[model samples]
Target: VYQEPTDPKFPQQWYLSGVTQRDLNVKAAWAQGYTGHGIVVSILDDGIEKNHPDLAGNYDPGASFDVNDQDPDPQPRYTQMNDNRHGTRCAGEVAAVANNGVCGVGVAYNARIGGVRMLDGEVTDAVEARSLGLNPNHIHIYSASWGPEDDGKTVDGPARLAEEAFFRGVSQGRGGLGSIFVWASGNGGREHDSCNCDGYTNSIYTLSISSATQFGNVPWYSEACSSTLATTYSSGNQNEKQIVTTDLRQKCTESHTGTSASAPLAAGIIALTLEANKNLTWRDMQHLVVQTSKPAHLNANDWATNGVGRKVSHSYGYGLLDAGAMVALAQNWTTVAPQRKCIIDILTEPKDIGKRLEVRKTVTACLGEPNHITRLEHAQARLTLSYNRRGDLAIHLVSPMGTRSTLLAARPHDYSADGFNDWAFMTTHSWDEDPSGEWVLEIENTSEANNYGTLTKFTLVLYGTASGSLVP
Candidate 1:
C-alpha cells in the first residue's frame, strides 16, 4: 500500500506504513479515493489548537463548543506550562492537512475536525452532558481519550444528565443515523486497574478502544477487559517508539503516547469508513468493525474464540483495527437489522458469598418474545452487591454455547466499601452467539483478604437484532 510518501513526516508514521505489515493499511483506502472528505469528528477534551498551520484547513466551527466558557470558541486555556496540549495533539491525529509539509499526515487527512473545551474546568454532570451532546446532528464522530481516574480505586461513570445525553446521541443524532462515539479504554494496567471498573468504557453506547505497540504487542499501560471492542496502535514501553502528530504552539511531536493517541486513530479510521458509505447506521459501523478487525499479530495470553468463532481477548478485543478492510467492507455493506433489547432479572434476593466466596447462576435467555435476540452483540450484567472490599471480586459470564467472558477483573488497589449500586458490566466477547440457551454468571472472591460480599440484585441486558441469521 505504500507507494510514495508525499507528506514529509509520512515516513515517520510506522503505524500507517507497510514496514511491519501490521499497521492500519490506510493507504489502500486513500488510493481508493476515500479520505474522509465529508465527515466531521469532534474531540471531547480540553480544547483544540484550531488555528495551527496543520489543522487550520480542516477545522470546523460547527462541530466545536466551549462548554466551560459558555461560548462558541473551543480554544484551550493556555498557561505557562502548556497544560492543555492534549486536544491539539489529538486533532492533528485525525485531520492534519496532507502534502503541506507542515507536519505528519492524519488518518483521515481531509476530514473536518473540532473540539469541545470542557475538561479544563470543573467537570460536573452538566458539563459532561453538554460536551457529549454538542451538535450531534452535525458531528459524525465524538472522539474521547479521557475517562475516570485510572487509580484502580474509583468506580464512576456518566451521571443522570450524561446518560440521557448518550441516549440522545445514539437515538436522534445524525438525523437518526446515530452519532458514533469512540472512547479510549483507560490506561491503568500498571495500577492493576480493570477497565470494567470505569463506567465510560463499560457503556455499550461507546466503542471502547485499546492500544497495541508498533511491534504488535499490548502496550504496558493498556487495560484489559471484555468491554473493549477493538484496538489501534499507540505507545509501548521505554524501548518502543511513541506516536507522531501535531503538537501545541504549531509544532510537531513524536512522543504522543498512551491510549489517548489510540482513540483519535480509531476515530480517523472510522471517518474514512463513513466517507466510504454515508448511509451506514451506528450498528452497521459496529458490525463492520467486528468483521474487519484482525487478531493475528497481537500477542496476548487470553485470546479465545467465542461461540461464533470470532477470536477475542480481554487485552485487544477482536483485534487491531484495519482501516483498509473496514473501508472496503463499508463500501457495499448492508445495514443491520434494527436494534432490540431483552432484560431479564436473574436474581433479586441477597445471596451470600459463603466460605467458598463464589456464587453462580444459570439463566435462560428470553424465548418466544418480540425482543428475543438469537444473535448477541453487547451483553451487560447490571449488578447491585454489598461488599467490604470491591477489589476482591471478579465477575465472569458464560454463554449457552460455552463461551466465557471476564466482565470484571479483581483490582488489588480498590479498597472501597460502597459496593456496586446497579453497576452494569458489559462484554463484547459473546458477539454473534445465540442467547437462547442457559446463561451463567459467576462471581468469585479472588483475593486472600478476609473480605465478604453478597449479591443483592442481578440482571442481564442483551442488545442486538432479533433477526435469525447474522448479516455481517
Candidate 2:
C-alpha cells in the first residue's frame, strides 16, 4: 500500500533543501524561456490528489485518464489505494510552478500534467497505462517511475505489449501523433547484486534515467546500464535528498527516495524541451539531450561500465540535471544539420591516370558559428579521399598540427552491397594537455588492389562540434 505524509511526520518544506530545489535557480532556467508551457506530460502511476493546492493549477483535467476504474475522476482516497503520495510526489516534480514564496519550484513549471491510475494490480495494468499514453488527446509524454524486480530476465506479458506500444509511439514521430516514454531505471542497488541491466532499463527505445545524490554522485541504491541516457537529483540519506511534492494524507509515511523520484525530474526537463520546440521528434529530442549534455570528467568510453566519471556515474549517466542546457537545445534545435562541401575529380592516384575516376573529396567540418574548435578537441580533422579499388578503404584524420588519427578502416562488405555510396562517422578526443590548429583529414585505400580506377568525385561533411556548439 502507498504511504501518506502526516503533518508531524511530514513537514511542509522538508524536501526543499534535500533535493537542492532552491539552488537549481529554476528562475534562471525559466528566464531563458523554458517553463515547459504548452507541453503535456502524463503520469501513469497510482492516482494523485488532483485537488492539491500545489498541483491543482497545473493539472489538466481533460487530459487525465483512469483505466482502472474506467472513469475520469482519479481522486485519491484513504483506503483502497496503493499510494497516492507516490504519484503526487512525481507529479509535483514535473509541474509544480514556483511563486507565492512557498515551496521550491519544479523543473517544468508551466507544463500540463495528466495522471493515470494504473498501479493498483498486476503488470497488466501497466499495459493499460501505455494505452492511455497512446490516446493522443490525453498525453504527449509518458512519465513512469516504476519498474519490475531486477532478476536480469525479461518476462513477456501485457507489460511487454505495453512497452512495444510505447516504442511504436516514439518511432511514429511528432507530426501524425506520438509520445516520448520516460522510464525510471529501477532502484535495486541495495540488494547484494542488483542492476538495471534488466530488460526494462536496457530497452533501446525507452529513455532510462537513474538517480543522483545531492552532491551529484551515483547513490548506492541506483543501478547502471548502457542504455541509461540521463540522470537528476533525487533524495538519498537525510543529508543528501531530493525535493518533491507528496500527498499530505495522514497515512503516508516515507519521504521521497528512489529512482522513481529521478524519473519525474528528467521528465520535467523533457517537458521544458518540448515547450521550447513543439515539433521535435523523439529521435531529435534524444539527440539534443545527449549532445548538449555536460560531459563528465571521467573516461568517455567507460560510460557503459564504470560510468562517465565522478560527476556522471553509470547510475547517474551525466552530472546533476541542467534544465537550462535542455531548454537552450530546444530553442536551437535546427543547428544540428551537418555542413557539406563536394568536389569532383580533385585528386588522382596516378598522374597519368588523372581524372580516370573522379576524386570524391569532402571535409567533415572545422567549426560552426558561436562555437570554436578548442585545443582539447585538436584531434578533429577533415577527411579527403580518392578511390582506386573496389575492396576495403581506410581513412585517417591528419590534423595540421601533425596529429595522425585513424578515422575509418573497413572493407566494402562493411557497407551495403547495393553499390550506393556509404559513410561512417567516428570521433577522438584530444590527447595533449594543450592542442590546437587547422587539421587535415586524410582518406586512402588500405587494401591490396592493382590497376584500380581512381575516384572522379569528392564530398565532405563536418560532424561533431562542426554541427553546432554545446554551449547556449
Against the hidden reference, what TM-scores do the models get? 0.97, 0.61
| Candidate 2 structure, TM-score to reference | 0.61
Give each model's whole-structure lDDT: 0.88, 0.52
Q: What is the C-alpha RMSD of each candidate to the true structure, in Å?
A: 1.6, 12.7
Q: Which portions of model 1 show Cα errors greater than 4 Å?
A: 1-5, 355-364, 468-472
Tens digits of lDDT, candidate 2, 254-368: 3577888877877888888778787776656666555455434323333431111123234445444556676776776773332122221224343222223222233223334
The worst-scoring run of ten residues by lDDT in candidate 1 lies at 354-363
RMSD of 2: 12.7
Candidate 1 pairs with clashing backbones = none
How many clashes does the backbone of model 2 have?
A: 29
Candidate 1: count the clashes: 0
